[PDB]
Amino acid sequence: ATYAQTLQNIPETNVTTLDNGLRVASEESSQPTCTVGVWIGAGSRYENEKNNGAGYFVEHLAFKGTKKRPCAAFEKEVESMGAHFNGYTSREQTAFYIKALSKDMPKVVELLADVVQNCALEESQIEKERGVILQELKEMDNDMTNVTFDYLHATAFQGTALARTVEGTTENIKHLTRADLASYIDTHFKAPRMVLAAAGGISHKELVDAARQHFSGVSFTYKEDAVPILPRCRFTGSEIRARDDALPVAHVALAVEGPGWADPDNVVLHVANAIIGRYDRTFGGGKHLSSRLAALAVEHKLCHSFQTFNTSYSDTGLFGFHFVADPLSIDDMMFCAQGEWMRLCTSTTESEVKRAKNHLRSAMVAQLDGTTPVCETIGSHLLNYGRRISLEEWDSRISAVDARMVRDVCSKYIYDKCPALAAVGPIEQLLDYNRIRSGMYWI
């Protein structure tokens, strides 16, 4: 029963829209258990300077209870049905979802609706979470990788909204008002911008009837039905070096502006990132690993790890790589890294893309390893790509990619481009933007 076929067999993802704008979608499996959630098209990018951190503060309350069912009432009801509720909030995408028995499919939707709509926002709890978020910041600040990507955005998108952290400023957390969290919810958590997605043993029809029932938003004026278009974020070849010779290792991330969800090149970009891949000191492969960079990394003890990435966004994106190294091998590593990038633009081989494509498909499949991940793909696809994109399609697109294509596309986005750099730790060895800028050409 060849791969090809198993692909065209996976049940189609159904989507139906309500009069309020809400879009309900789902992929039905025989699974006795399931996952359902609302993927809102909101994040820190929608926040401005005065409320940076709202969507995150709000994330901390969508679970402390609603108007109808207060704290214990909510938790008790949810804990007692063996369900798992949890979510997240990115720069331009927020999500809240539950993992429950396909049986409870309809009661969950009710619960979801009650959260996005009737958050209690108990002004008593607010002051508590305020101290919690402040505490999580102290912690997240010790996560070099995070510090490094935030900074990456901080300078690559300096001057724009995309250059803000999701968690927000220490001041905003200390001062946001119930009212602020209030309007945040009112302004963003809106039907035409939300997506009720589900995966598992669930009837799409049953799913949508339940949606109609509690997700009964009303829309009178045109304004309400409209989805705002965010102001464009300006990428800037720049660098931010936060140095502290006291930290054990050093983090380095370099990137170029990426196209954005909609753009087909992304496929090619992924196939490329698939060649250089990623590495880490516990990869059994060793000196024989296929990725030259990885291989080089191993042969020269160049880094405790490295990883490529193609972080997409609506209108923009970040295509780069990140590596952790010892103070004294930062240069050799950076050198080799740009080396492979230049190689991508100038000499990618068919054999490489062949391996890359296979590896990619495999990752593509792992993206749908369970109701939750599958669900996450739906919520995001609709939200980002507008519709759903089947593995059969992705797989198609991927197959079209070839060396020539990789080189052209990579040259297009990499060659002779002013990159964005972020470095943290004992970064004295790696140095000079110029020296790095010249690494952008010839290979």
């Binding site: 936060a242 000079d432 933007y433 110029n434």
Partner: protein
């Protein structure tokens, strides 16, 4: 005393022209690369 006299001067003319064009293009070039440093901003954010 100096037959080259005339050519010596014609060369001087060409020399000045090139020297101007070139010193200029090289001043721009030196500046370009150095801007990275000229506008460079820094800050001391000790931990607390």
């Amino acid at each position: 005393a100096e037959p080259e006299h005339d050519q010596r001067k014609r060369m001087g003319l060409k020399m000045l022209l090139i020297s101007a064009l070139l010193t200029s293009l090289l001043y721009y070039m030196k500046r370009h690369k150095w801007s990275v440093l000229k506008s460079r901003k820094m800050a001391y954010r000790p931990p607390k």
